[PDB]
Specification:
- The structure is cut from a larger assembly and holds six copies of chain A.
- The first copy, chain A, is α+β, with helices and mostly antiparallel strands.
- In chain A, 40% of the residues lie in helices and 10% in strands.
- Chain A has a two-stranded antiparallel sheet.
- In chain A, a hairpin with a 2-residue loop joins strand 1 and strand 2.
- The longest helix of chain A has 15 residues.
- Chain A starts with 11 loop residues before the first strand and ends with a helix.
- Chains in contact: A-B, A-C, A-D, A-E, A-F, B-D, B-F, C-D, C-E, D-E, D-F.
- Chain A: It comes from Bluetongue virus 1.
- Chain A: This is VP3.
- Chain A: It is found in: Virion.
- The PDB classes it as viral protein.
């Protein structure tokens, strides 16, 4: 599993000036074991339609 | 223009590897280059102050 | 929504499973020879969602999704390739059951 | 300097884009991304960094690259003129000591 | 060596989160199916 | 003001600028007194053919 590039969400124009994304708190969060298992279930559902 | 004013200036063959002015279309033809151009403009031209 | 998800091509090695799945209307061949520019990749539902998000006054979220779209479409292209190439077997569901 | 390096890259792309039509028996497995990568591997790192300032946030594919290459504008310099003359002089590959 | 995996821009480059395979997912699917019915039959008579 | 010992330019862009400045000083030609040898000869047991 591959994360997206961090430069897609934020742009740095100056050392003290940066753009902020709307979902910054969700991006920095980390999942628990049950949540990784749910992600696996979602991908399994995607990979076998119906 | 000090390099062109010594007393041996009439016996000199000048070699210039780069030309001026620059064609701006070459810079602005790079695909989706607006943000990079803005960053370079800030990095090269912006002053500091109080 | 308004997209062709299942199509048919030349006969399959396994006779009971003849279908090709194309999520989001994207093809696995598009990673080799694209038919649009980078800014031109889109499909109906995602564009409609962007328009609705703009109409609702939520512009930063719409910008985030507009930037994220190529990653989403490349992911679904890889899923399409995995489904159509790796998973072809006799243990696949037959076409008539899939339709029913 | 930046404009000169961009022009040299464009000339290299233009001349390398015809080899697959010239030699179908050698480049039967080739794709445009191959010569794109080959040209990128022989370019200064700073110009690529300047381009990556924008291409890390935005997505481009080979259609954008081919449109950029075919645009007419170039920045004349000594290295560019010598590169164009060198590409012209190697028009026949008996001069590069390759034959079938 | 496949042409689909060649990357010429840093847009598609990201960090590796985790891995997964075939046998692991098969065993996982079987466990998920069995656990649900066992839990349901445990919660009601 | 006297304690503003900080640079606001992003170090990556500064490294890019330094690399381009160092690239601007290259030399792609050379000055010589004689040209390189284009034709040479092989001597055999003959006094008039090579």
């Amino acid at each position: 599993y591959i994360a997206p590039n961090p430069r897609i969400s934020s742009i740095t124009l100056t050392q003290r000036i940066t753009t902020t994304g709307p979902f910054a708190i969700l991006t920095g969060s980390t999942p628990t074991a049950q949540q990784l298992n749910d992600v696996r279930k979602i991908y399994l559902a995607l990979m076998f339609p119906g | 223009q000090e390099v062109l004013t010594d007393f041996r200036r009439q016996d000199t063959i000048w070699v210039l590897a780069l030309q001026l002015p620059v064609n701006p279309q070459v810079v602005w033809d790079v695909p989706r280059s607006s943000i990079a151009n803005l960053i370079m403009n800030i990095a090269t031209c912006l002053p500091t102050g109080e | 929504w308004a997209t062709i998800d299942v199509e048919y091509r030349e006969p399959a090695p396994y006779v009971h499973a003849q279908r090709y799945i194309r999520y989001c209307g994207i093809d696995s061949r598009e990673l080799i020879n694209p038919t649009t520019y980078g800014i031109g990749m889109t499909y109906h539902c995602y564009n409609e969602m962007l328009r609705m998000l703009v109409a609702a006054g939520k512009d930063s979220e719409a910008a985030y999704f507009r930037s994220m779209l190529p990653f989403h479409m490349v992911r679904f292209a890889r899923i399409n390739q995995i489904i159509n190439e790796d998973l072809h077997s006799v243990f696949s569901l037959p076409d008539d059951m899939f339709n029913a | 300097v930046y404009a000169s390096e961009l022009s040299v890259m464009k000339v290299d792309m233009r001349h390398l884009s015809l080899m697959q039509r010239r030699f179908p028996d050698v480049l039967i497995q080739a794709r445009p991304s191959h010569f794109w990568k080959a040209v990128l591997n022989d370019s200064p790192e700073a110009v690529k960094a300047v381009m990556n300032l924008s291409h890390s946030h935005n997505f481009i594919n080979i259609r954008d690259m081919m449109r950029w290459v075919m645009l007419p504008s170039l920045q004349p310099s000594l290295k560019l003129a010598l590169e164009e003359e060198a590409w012209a002089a190697a028009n026949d590959f008996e001069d590069l000591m390759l034959t079938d | 060596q496949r042409p689909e995996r060649i990357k010429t821009t840093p847009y598609l480059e990201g960090d590796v989160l985790s891995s997964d395979s075939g046998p692991l997912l098969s065993v996982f699917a079987l466990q998920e199916i069995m656990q649900k019915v066992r839990q349901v039959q445990a919660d009601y008579m | 003001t006297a304690t503003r010992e900080v640079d606001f330019t992003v170090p990556d862009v500064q490294k890019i600028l330094d690399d381009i400045k160092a690239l601007a000083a290259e030399q792609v030609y050379k000055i010589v007194k004689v040209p390189s040898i284009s034709f040479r000869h092989i001597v055999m047991q003959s006094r008039d053919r090579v």
